């Protein structure tokens, strides 16, 4: 592995490309013969909203480190 660091050259017997989506480093290894087309990916926009620990209990119907997940269609 070569890095953006100045003296950065890490030697290894194997390299695990666990770098997620945007397969920039996968294309350098010969895998991913093309880039991602805009039908293999989904733009996911997320907000983390500060809701003060008791309205979370009220609007989800839970209490005390028990959680609920909503899936919105």
């Amino acid at each position: 592995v070569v890095t953006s660091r100045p003296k950065g050259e890490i030697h290894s017997k194997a390299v695990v490309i666990a770098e997620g989506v945007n397969p920039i480093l996968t294309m350098k290894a010969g895998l991913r013969k093309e880039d991602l087309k805009p039908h293999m990916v989904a733009v996911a926009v997320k907000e983390v909203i500060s809701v003060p620990e008791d309205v979370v209990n009220r609007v989800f119907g839970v209490e005390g480190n028990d959680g609920a997940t909503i899936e919105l269609l």
Binding site: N22, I24, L36, P38
Partner: peptide, 19 residues
């Protein structure tokens, strides 16, 4: 990484920023 992918002509030199 949307811009690099949604661009039809490939003319976005897209990198991650440095570490």
């Amino acid at each position: 990484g949307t811009c690099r992918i949604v661009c039809p002509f490939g003319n976005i030199e897209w990198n991650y920023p440095r570490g």
